[PDB]
Design a protein around this motif. Structure first.
Motif: not given
Lengths: 126, 153
Positions: A21-44
């Motif tokens: 079993q394995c796993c790892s991290s990442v670096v990717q940030m956005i300047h639009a508000p977070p809830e505006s991002v969550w918006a897209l990260v919510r619709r499977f």
């Protein structure tokens, strides 16, 4: 890693390693508000075809609207996703079934995430 | 972007979409100078510089007419050329002659107006709404990977 605010990222992005079993991290940030991002990260959408066949067996195990957390999984994966704008870390889990090595797989399941959290920044410029 | 854009997007892109030979463009915009953009992209030696899902890659005795041996899971491996390395008018094209893989004829024109034109002998003995989407996405990821590595954003 020990990010800026690894707080809801804590219990989640903390995954247990194993013998296969394995796993790892990442670096990717956005300047639009977070809830505006969550918006897209919510619709499977983001197989990708290529190889002759293409199968998956996904499942939702966490859904948190107030604090922003959606944990993918398989039926081994266990993707977790967290959040003047917003941050977006990433982590998962996996398997090395006889056939390859972690420096091909976790770099075969690595390279895709960037191309998945990169897809998300375009859709919310800055 | 726009309509004063053929400067080098005429003699290239205006190209032979034959019967089973498909192609398509790529909307992308970067806030670094096109010179700064060009360096990162120019590197055909290492395509790894910014191009995704690659593996180790050599050449043959970067240049115009010098082959390479890029490779990408199970199996499949890619062998290309560099017909055009125009260094003033930012343009690279390269065919995948001597490849090991399915996806046939290719001449991936990356010009900078920042656009990547791809061509694929329409049939991999398969569909067409997939041949485009399989690669055009691959394309998508890379130029998106181009953008990141330079301070466009």
């Amino acid at each position: 890693r020990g990010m800026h605010v690894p707080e809801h990222v804590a219990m989640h992005h903390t995954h247990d390693v194993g013998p296969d079993q394995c796993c790892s991290s990442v670096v990717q940030m956005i300047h639009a508000p977070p809830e505006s991002v969550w918006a897209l990260v919510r619709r499977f959408k983001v197989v990708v075809s290529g190889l002759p066949a293409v199968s998956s067996t996904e499942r939702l195990e966490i859904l948190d609207e107030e604090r922003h957390v959606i944990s993918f999984s398989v039926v081994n994966y266990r993707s977790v996703t967290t959040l003047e704008g917003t941050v977006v870390v990433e982590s998962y889990i996996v398997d090395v079934p006889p056939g390859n090595t972690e420096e091909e797989t976790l770099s075969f399941v690595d390279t895709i995430v960037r191309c998945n959290l990169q897809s998300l920044a375009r859709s919310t410029n800055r």
